[PDB]
RNA sequence: UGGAGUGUUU
C-alpha cells in the first residue's frame, strides 16, 4: 500500500531540449511556526476569514504580531516566518469587521521544518505534505486577496472587456499556481487558465439571455411550464443580491409574484396569507413592474422567502459548474486555444507581472522564484509499426503521430453482404438522391479499405420519431437473414440516437452505425474511411495490429490490459447516478476489448463493484484466449487527493478478483493512474523541433527527470500530435507494480497502446483501454429514458450478449 | 451522430 520507488531512468528515444512551466524555488533553511485559528462563527466563507485575519494583523500590530506578515490559508491555519510572542498557550481576542464582530483564538501548534523537506528532496526519506502545504499557503496569500481564487487558480474581471458565451455566461482569464516537489529542489508550476463564469447582471436580463429574449417586454404574458423549468434549472443554486445582502436560490416558484403568497403574522398575532406583490407594495413601497413573472425562493427551502426577479442581480464571480451548450464550448475553445509559443509567452508575462521575488509575504519567508523556465531533456520514443492486412499486408509507419490507410487494407476486414438503412432525416432534405450516391461512394472506400460491402442495402426506408425505432428494429432482425449492420441517418441532435443505441446495444444484438444528415449529402473519402474504421470493429473485424515483433517483453506471457474511468452526471442533479466503466483486452494484439459497466452512487469516484467487474473480464479473457493472464496492467483515469482511497479499495478489489476466481492464482498487478487534468506544459527549446501550426512537441516526447517525483515512479508522455492549441502531455503514476517494470519498457508499452485506438489512424493522448473506458461509460449515459431504483438502472446499462463480444462503444 | 486534438426578513 505504498507506491514503489523509481526503478531506473529511461534511455530509449532521441533526446531533445525542452522547457517546462516549472520555476525553480530557492527555499531557505528555517523552522516556520504554524498556529491554529478558530473563528466563531465557523461558518463564514474563506473570503471573510481572510479579511478577519487581515484586519486582525493590523489591529494587533504593536500588541501581538509586530512588523511581520503572516500567511493564512483561509480556514483555521496561520503561519509566520519567526515565532509569535504568544509562546504556547491559547490567546483569545476580538475582531471587528467594518456592525458585526468575530471571536478568534490563536494557539501555537507545532513547527514546520523546511530543512526537513530539503532532505526528502535529496533522495533520503517520502516527502512531508505539511511543509509543501505550508509553502503553498505562503505563495497564495497575496493572490488570495488580490484576485478571486478558484481551486488552485486565480481569476479576475480586470477588464479584458467581456468574452460572452451566451445564456448568461462568459469566459474569464486567470492562472493556475501550485507548489510541486521534484528531485533536489521545489518547483512553482505556473500556467494560464480560463473558465466559465456567470455574467453579473440583473436577474431579469439573465432570464432574457437564458430563453433568448431581445428584452423582457417580449413576454407581456407569464412563463410557460417549459420556460419556467428551463429557467429554474439555470438559476438553481446560484447566488443573488438584493436591490447588499446575498441569498442562495433553491427554487423558482410556480406562481407569479402577484399570486405567490407567504404566511405573514399580523400585530394581533394571527397569520394571514399575503402575496409577494402586495407585501412589496406595502413594506417596500415598490410596485412590481413584472408581477406576471415568478419569484426566487431563497434561503432554507421552508422559510418561504420569495424575492421578485426585478430586485435581484446574479452575484459577481460565480464559476459556471453546469454543463455548457455545444455552441458555448466552441466559443470557449476558439477563445482560449493558444499555440505552444504563444502560451509560453503568456506564462512568461505572468511571471513578470506576478514578480514573486518582490511579494512581501514571499520575501518575508525568504523565498526566491527563478524567473526562467526549467530546462528539461526529453526523449522522443520511436513509434510502433502498424501491421495492416488485405493483399500486401502494408506496414504503416506513424509520422508525427499520424498515418493513413492509403494502399493499405484492414488486418481482418469484414465482408458485409446484407445490411439496411434507417433514415430519420426528412427525404426533402436527404432525398433518395443523396441516399444512393452516399451508398455508392460508401462502397468505393469500403472496397479500398479491405472491408468490401457487396450488394446494395437489402432495405432502405424512412422513419420519424423515437417511438418508431423499437418496432422497426424488431422487424429488421426477425425479417432479414444474416443482417450484420444497420446504418441510421440523423438530422442533427435528436433523442432518436439514444433509443437507437439503447435498442441496438441492450434489447437486441445488432450493430448500428449512426451518421449525420450533412455527412451524407456531401460525402468525402476520408470521412468515409473513418466511418469504415468504426463499423469494421463494430462487426468483429481487426482494423490493424501492432507489429507483433515490435512489442515489448511483457507480451511473452499472457497479459490483459484494463482501462477504468467513472463518468459523473454532466452537471448538478443527484437523481441520476455515476457510471463506472472497466474494459479489458481479449487477445494478444491487443485489439478487441470487452466492456463492463456499473451504475453506482452519485459522484462516487471509487469503483465500488470493481472486484466483480475484473472477475467478468478475466473470465471473458479466458474464454477468448484459453489463457489466464500472468500480468494485469491497469490504466486508471486520473483522480483528485484520493490516491490511497483509490489505491486501497481498487487495488485490493483487483487482487480479490483473482483469488476468488481460483485459490493460488496471483498474477502480477501494475497499477497506473493516467492524468490529463494538470498544468504541466512542455515547450521545444529549438525552433526546429516544433511540430505543426501550433508548434507543439512531437508525439512520443517523454520526460521522467527534473520535474517528476523525487522518489516515486511517474513520468510524462505526450503520445499525441497537437492540432489546435497547446498539447496536454499525459502524466502516468505507477501506484503499484508487482511486475518490476523498467522505465523504458513501461513508457514504450504505454506509448504503443496509444496506437491501438481503432477510431482513427493516429496516436491518441491516452492508451486505448483508458480511452475505451470513457467511451463505454459515456455510451451508458444514452441508456437512460424519460419519454428510478438501483436494480432498474443497472438493468438498462446491461448489454446484449451478442454485441458484448464486439466494440459497440466505438 | 466520421475522427482526433485544443478550454473547462419573505
Ligand atoms: Mg474520469
Numbering used by the authors: 23 to 120, 125 to 151, 153 to 270, 276 to 672, 674 to 820, 837 to 859
What does the paper say about this structure?
AGO proteins use small RNA guides to identify complementary sites in transcripts targeted for silencing or repression. AGO proteins create the seed region by pre‐organizing guide nucleotides g2–g7 in a helical conformation, thereby lowering the entropic cost of initiating target binding (Wang et al, 2008; Parker et al, 2009; Schirle & MacRae, 2012). Here, we show that this major functional distinction depends on a minor structural difference between plant and animal AGO proteins: a 9‐amino acid loop in the PIWI domain.
We next asked whether the AtAGO10 PIWI loop also adopts a stabilized conformation when swapped into HsAGO2. The stabilized loop reaches across the central cleft and forms two interactions with the L2 loop: The N603 sidechain is within hydrogen‐bonding distance of the mainchain amide of K355, and the mainchain carbonyl of G604 may form a hydrogen bond with the sidechain of K354. Thus, the swapped‐in AtAGO10 PIWI loop adopts a defined conformation within HsAGO2 without otherwise impacting the overall structure. Fitting the time course data to the burst‐and‐steady‐state equation (Arif et al, 2022) shows that product release (k 3) is 3.9 ± 1.8 times faster for HsAGO2 + At‐loop than wild‐type HsAGO2 at 36°C. The combined results show that swapping the AtAGO10 PIWI loop into HsAGO2 creates an HsAGO2 variant with decreased affinity for targets lacking sufficient complementarity to be cleaved and accelerated the turnover of targets that are cleaved. Thus, consistent with in vitro measurements, the engineered HsAGO2 + At‐loop displays superior RNAi properties, with enhanced siRNA‐like targeting silencing and reduced miRNA‐like targeting in mammalian cells.
